[model samples]
Target: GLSDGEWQQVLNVWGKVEADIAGHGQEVLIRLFTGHPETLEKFDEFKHLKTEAEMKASEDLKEHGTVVLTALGGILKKKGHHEAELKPLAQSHATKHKIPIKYLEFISDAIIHVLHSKHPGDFGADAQGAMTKALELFRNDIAAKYKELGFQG
Candidate 1:
């Protein structure tokens, strides 16, 4: 759980970057793929892209990235009111996409890294921790839904 101040920090930082959803989201996806190449194996269209440049140039990557960021923006907008909205998304990722929890963590790390890199001064240790915790709460909810769907691995 985030303190009111932490929640404000999240809204502030996210507000600053949400305008360029596609660009920032692309960076997050790029960072994830760069750090954990195996994660890309889940994406049929993206698995063949060997380099960051190729991934960036991919229309499919950009489109999906934008969609993810947009969903994130919605989640962030109604921070405490996410369970109802996130449940379906969580279930779909587990049953349909079959994304494991570790990959979700990878995405979280990528987003946090991008936030710090893009706003070095604004997103200090405290702010970063707050944002990370907030995302963790969301991730936990998703993980719970995934578990409920009988995804054992």
Candidate 2:
């Protein structure tokens, strides 16, 4: 859970980058794919994009990135109150896609990486910790749904 001040930090940094949601979202996925190529296996369409250039020009990547950013935007707008909104996404990923909980956990790293790269000065240690806590709360919410559905590893 994030304190009011921590939430404000999140909003400030997110606001700084939200205008370029598509780019930021794409960057997040790119970073994840670069750091953990296996993660691309989770996305049937994205898995085929082997290079950064391929990913950047991919319509599927753009669409999926928009979806991810939109969800994050919703959570930011409600100051994490919209966490329940992620339930459907989590359910689908767990039941339909069979995505493991660990992959979900990696999203936090990708998000934080983007924030740091985009807003180097604004994303200080305090901000990083706040964002980490916020993402953890988000991840936990999704994890609960995965658990409810008995989606193991």
Candidate 3:
């Protein structure tokens, strides 16, 4: 589990990203829409399930899926606060990489699939560990991209 301060840091970064992208003449929704195919479908399905099998499966998968966004500072600063506006960040990266939007969507979903396949029942531990790992991955990815794009990291 993240310490309170660490959680706050995560929120701060998330807010920074949101503020940076808002109203910059960038179509965040278009970017997100073009970036990740079927993401909305999966998200919708993930949202509406009532059975025990459904809950466990969805929670486990949702937990896994979220870690990547968390790594990328996608989660909001508030608890259970989902930000629809930031979906375009995913699209921006997908467009930048020239990869198919579906590919990016798969990358996001695959994180969850891999984690759940690796650790099914005791997923909280796996999630915590993956959160740290994902944070490092995010930092490295950003640093590398900034260097490649001629920006100071």
How does each model score on lDDT? Answer: 0.86, 0.82, 0.41
TM match of model 1 to true structure: 0.94
lDDT ranking of the models: 1, 2, 3
* Tens digits of lDDT, candidate 3, 46-101: 43543324444444444543444444454434332333433344344544533333
Ranking by TM-score: 1, 2, 3
Alpha-carbon RMSD of each model? 1.2, 1.5, 15.9
Query: Which scores greater on TM-score, model 1 or model 2?
Result: 1
Residue 119 lDDT in candidate 1: 74
Residue range 28-84, candidate 2, lDDT tens digits: 888888788888988886788877888888877877888888888787767778657
Best candidate, lDDT:
1
Q: In candidate 3, residue 138 scores what lDDT?
A: 42
Model 3, runs deviating above 4 Å:
1-70, 73-88, 124-153
By how many angstroms RMSD does model 3 differ from the true structure?
Answer: 15.9
